[PDB]
Amino acid sequence: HHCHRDPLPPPGLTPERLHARRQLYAACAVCFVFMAGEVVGGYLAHSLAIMTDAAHLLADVGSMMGSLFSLWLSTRPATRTMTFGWHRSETLGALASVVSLWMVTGILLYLAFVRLLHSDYHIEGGAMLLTASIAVCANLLMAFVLHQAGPGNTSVRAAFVHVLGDLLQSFGVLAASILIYFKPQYKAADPISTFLFSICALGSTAPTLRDVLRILMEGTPRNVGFEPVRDTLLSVPGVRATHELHLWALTLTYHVASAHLAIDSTADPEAVLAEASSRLYSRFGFSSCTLQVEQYQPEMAQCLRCQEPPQASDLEVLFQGPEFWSH
Amino acid sequence: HHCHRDPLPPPGLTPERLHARRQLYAACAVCFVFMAGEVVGGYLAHSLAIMTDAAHLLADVGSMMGSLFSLWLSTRPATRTMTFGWHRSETLGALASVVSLWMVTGILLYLAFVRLLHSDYHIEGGAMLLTASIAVCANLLMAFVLHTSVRAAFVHVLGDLLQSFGVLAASILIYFKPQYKAADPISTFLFSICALGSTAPTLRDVLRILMEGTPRNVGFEPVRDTLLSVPGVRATHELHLWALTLTYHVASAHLAIDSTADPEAVLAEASSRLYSRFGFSSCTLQVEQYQPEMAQCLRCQEPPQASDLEVLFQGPEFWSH
Ligand SMILES: CCCCCCCCCCC(CCCCCCCCCC)(CO[C@@H]1O[C@H](CO)[C@@H](O[C@H]2O[C@H](CO)[C@@H](O)[C@H](O)[C@H]2O)[C@H](O)[C@H]1O)CO[C@@H]1O[C@H](CO)[C@@H](O[C@H]2O[C@H](CO)[C@@H](O)[C@H](O)[C@H]2O)[C@H](O)[C@H]1O
Ligand SMILES: CCCCCCCCCCC(CCCCCCCCCC)(CO[C@@H]1O[C@H](CO)[C@@H](O[C@H]2O[C@H](CO)[C@@H](O)[C@H](O)[C@H]2O)[C@H](O)[C@H]1O)CO[C@@H]1O[C@H](CO)[C@@H](O[C@H]2O[C@H](CO)[C@@H](O)[C@H](O)[C@H]2O)[C@H](O)[C@H]1O
Ligand SMILES: CC(C)CCC[C@@H](C)[C@H]1CC[C@H]2[C@@H]3CC=C4C[C@@H](OC(=O)CCC(=O)O)CC[C@]4(C)[C@H]3CC[C@]12C
Ligand SMILES: CC(C)CCC[C@@H](C)[C@H]1CC[C@H]2[C@@H]3CC=C4C[C@@H](OC(=O)CCC(=O)O)CC[C@]4(C)[C@H]3CC[C@]12C
Ligand SMILES: [Zn+2]
Ligand SMILES: [Zn+2]
Ligand SMILES: [Zn+2]
Ligand SMILES: [Zn+2]
Ligand SMILES: [Zn+2]
Ligand SMILES: [Zn+2]
């Protein structure tokens, strides 16, 4: 046919999409209510380790909100001001969740630093122990529910690992609470625990921001490489040297490509165009590929704007920057 | 030429860029010194209007740093993983500045609400008056030094000069009558609301640019009409035009041509018309035979005339289900 060959038609209200959104807000509601209970307990206990656990629960709630808004907004069609669509809402929500986690972790880190230096605080061991045990039981209940509700095919399995990690962190906080309750004169255990767990949370959120910032710079997607795309385009019969090969990603799974193709004077543009588009779709699954077909016009051999970028890496290409810094 | 007519290949380093480099360093150093003075004064006096002034200076310094890093990055060429270049550093720096402003002003609102509720804080009137007077004097000195980016700097300095006259008025009122201690939280509240109202439009523009949205200056209808005006075109579909920054615009579209039209002629005419009329920094358009099956095909139909709010209002049916 035409550029619609083997195209996946995206509907609005997919029943699988409805199931996903249903389980998503169920998990979100459970996380929010248990976060509320746990933060009330932490405010009662005047501690900060369970405050770090509540911050982690807040991060989980924010991530679920970001996923839910993205899921809803993906159903809406592309408009005259959002011609690509509302896909990048997922990336923006991920960045917002990371920023919120950074803010809360920084606030808690500053509070822990103040508590460590001033060392003027009292901790209610009776309340802290009860609320930490409640959190541990909550994580165990969530894990048991997820295992029982498993074998949505991959969502439950993906959530199970995170529940296990939260359970391990809850065991850490519970051990800190035991140490504080049995020996109240070790009251500095709570700031140390919250400091270490905030550092761990920042380390865990470090890699999920690199991908978001790489996407939000119109950068090449991690999965798809420039070299395979260029080789695939050049391997199409009748194709000479190409230029202006722009390919980027709207999200982790939505990849868009664009290129200029220079063909021989004896090659039919339609056939080579269709072959290149089909090859790109089959090999890489680009969700949108609008490539331009031109005659060779040998004058581009001397054109500086038609030269492909060098194989230098991002870290390497920025090492000549200090020349501008020095000046 | 072929497709790069009027290439405009900007040099990596230009003397104007070095001049902007020197100007930005001077401004950033002055603003950082003024930040140091303001924060020391506020910490000494245990006030909060000085903290709001320091927050605005933090926003200004963040804007300076973002603009300077963007200027540095614009020099660097396109990389095999950054094929579009480092252009969107402008947008990311603006977003970072706005986010930092929002976080700092949220902390300040929290502190102001706590101070208003507890109503127990001993603030030294003399020290806070001294730092407010120093801030006003420094802002007037910068205005006098300032006597393009120069006009924008002058109007921003005037705005901040009124911003600091607010602090000076609050300071003289609290110093003349120590009883009116509660004027500081009100001043901080009003000042922060003004800052939020000022910083909302830039956040909206940055979010529109990041979401691959159509740039405000360029309209979908003029581009569609221009692409349909060239002879030999009957179906423009999958038009995708977005913007890396406020000034960098990228466009991409199909062009369905009939069997009687030369693809290169219409391609060159459309590219020239787009570059001349809208100034697109990169236009990559695809030419195809009309293939009348496109008349009944589904996703090669133009999106309907509807605003972003209008289309989103049909969304609420999703949640109920
Ligand atoms: C009624 C029961 C069913 C409920 C199931 C619904 C839950 C779905 C969310 C699971 C979740 C919530 C955490 C659950 C806490 C409590 C939940 C349950 C408690 C209440 C009963 C935790 O998922 C975990 O998050 C961790 C954070 O990375 C991470 O861990 C791992 O990564 C480490 C490196 O990162 C590494 O070391 C190691 O590989 C792991 O450690 C993994 O992402 C994952 O294990 C969110 O993370 C998921 O991550 C996916 C890609 O990120 C993404 O999935 C999709 O979402 C939409 C779906 O269609 C849809 O838009 C998309 O397909 C997609 O975007 C979403 O972001 C989010 O869904
Ligand atoms: C020793 C000499 C130093 C001279 C300083 C030169 C620095 C120039 C920066 C001035 C600045 C900070 C101002 C802080 C003042 C400094 C205080 C102390 C300094 C004195 C020691 C003004 O900041 C803007 O000013 C606008 C006008 O005030 C105003 O916007 C609103 O208010 C108006 C009503 O006021 C009203 O019309 C309207 O509602 C709005 O318009 C806002 O204040 C604010 O957005 C920076 O932002 C400006 O905006 C540009 C995009 O950000 C930016 O250009 C960039 O693009 C270039 C090409 O793409 C490229 O080259 C670079 O990417 C970069 O340049 C410029 O940098 C600058 O033009
Ligand atoms: C803690 C949780 C609740 C956060 C959820 C994630 C958000 C950061 C996401 C959810 C949906 C996203 C929004 C979806 C739609 C738009 C519209 C878009 O605005 C326009 O196109 C302007 C239209 C106009 O003003 O006419 C700007 C980005 C924005 C606000 C997105 C920015 C990021 C948002 C707010
Ligand atoms: C003093 C503070 C409060 C002011 C704000 C700090 C700025 C100097 C920061 C804010 C956001 C930063 C930008 C955010 C993201 C990026 C992407 C980053 O691109 C990458 O190479 C990452 C992705 C990849 O490796 O592919 C380059 C630096 C840059 C422009 C950052 C430069 C430094 C900026 C402007
Ligand atoms: Zn097409
Ligand atoms: Zn979790
Ligand atoms: Zn060329
Ligand atoms: Zn070309
Ligand atoms: Zn200012
Ligand atoms: Zn079609």
PDB file of N, CA and C and ligand atoms in Angstrom, chain A residues 2-4, chain B residues 237 293-301, ligand 10:
ATOM      1  N   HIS A   2       0.810   2.006   1.094  1.00  0.00           N
ATOM      2  CA  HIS A   2       1.592   3.230   1.238  1.00  0.00           C
ATOM      3  C   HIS A   2       2.177   3.233   2.649  1.00  0.00           C
ATOM      4  N   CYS A   3       2.594   4.407   3.129  1.00  0.00           N
ATOM      5  CA  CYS A   3       3.410   4.516   4.338  1.00  0.00           C
ATOM      6  C   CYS A   3       2.701   3.989   5.584  1.00  0.00           C
ATOM      7  N   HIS A   4       1.490   3.476   5.401  1.00  0.00           N
ATOM      8  CA  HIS A   4       0.654   2.872   6.428  1.00  0.00           C
ATOM      9  C   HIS A   4       0.881   1.374   6.564  1.00  0.00           C
TER      10      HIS A   4
ATOM     11  N   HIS B 237       0.069  15.221   5.039  1.00  0.00           N
ATOM     12  CA  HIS B 237      -0.336  14.454   6.210  1.00  0.00           C
ATOM     13  C   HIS B 237       0.846  14.148   7.107  1.00  0.00           C
ATOM     14  N   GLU B 293      -5.838   5.742  -2.477  1.00  0.00           N
ATOM     15  CA  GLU B 293      -6.200   5.043  -1.250  1.00  0.00           C
ATOM     16  C   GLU B 293      -6.004   5.915  -0.014  1.00  0.00           C
ATOM     17  N   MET B 294      -5.182   6.965  -0.109  1.00  0.00           N
ATOM     18  CA  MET B 294      -5.006   7.893   1.004  1.00  0.00           C
ATOM     19  C   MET B 294      -6.278   8.653   1.350  1.00  0.00           C
ATOM     20  N   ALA B 295      -7.230   8.750   0.419  1.00  0.00           N
ATOM     21  CA  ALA B 295      -8.469   9.466   0.709  1.00  0.00           C
ATOM     22  C   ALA B 295      -9.250   8.788   1.827  1.00  0.00           C
ATOM     23  N   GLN B 296      -9.308   7.458   1.814  1.00  0.00           N
ATOM     24  CA  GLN B 296     -10.062   6.701   2.804  1.00  0.00           C
ATOM     25  C   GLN B 296      -9.204   6.177   3.948  1.00  0.00           C
ATOM     26  N   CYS B 297      -7.889   6.382   3.907  1.00  0.00           N
ATOM     27  CA  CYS B 297      -7.039   5.880   4.976  1.00  0.00           C
ATOM     28  C   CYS B 297      -7.251   6.707   6.242  1.00  0.00           C
ATOM     29  N   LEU B 298      -6.913   6.112   7.385  1.00  0.00           N
ATOM     30  CA  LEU B 298      -7.355   6.663   8.664  1.00  0.00           C
ATOM     31  C   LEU B 298      -6.385   7.698   9.231  1.00  0.00           C
ATOM     32  N   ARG B 299      -5.157   7.291   9.546  1.00  0.00           N
ATOM     33  CA  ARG B 299      -4.293   8.149  10.347  1.00  0.00           C
ATOM     34  C   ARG B 299      -3.567   9.200   9.518  1.00  0.00           C
ATOM     35  N   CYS B 300      -3.752   9.208   8.200  1.00  0.00           N
ATOM     36  CA  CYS B 300      -3.219  10.267   7.346  1.00  0.00           C
ATOM     37  C   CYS B 300      -4.267  11.339   7.090  1.00  0.00           C
ATOM     38  N   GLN B 301      -5.099  11.596   8.094  1.00  0.00           N
ATOM     39  CA  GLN B 301      -6.058  12.687   8.088  1.00  0.00           C
ATOM     40  C   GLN B 301      -5.617  13.725   9.109  1.00  0.00           C
TER      41      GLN B 301
HETATM   42 ZN    ZN C  10      -3.023   6.541   4.617  1.00  0.00          ZN
END
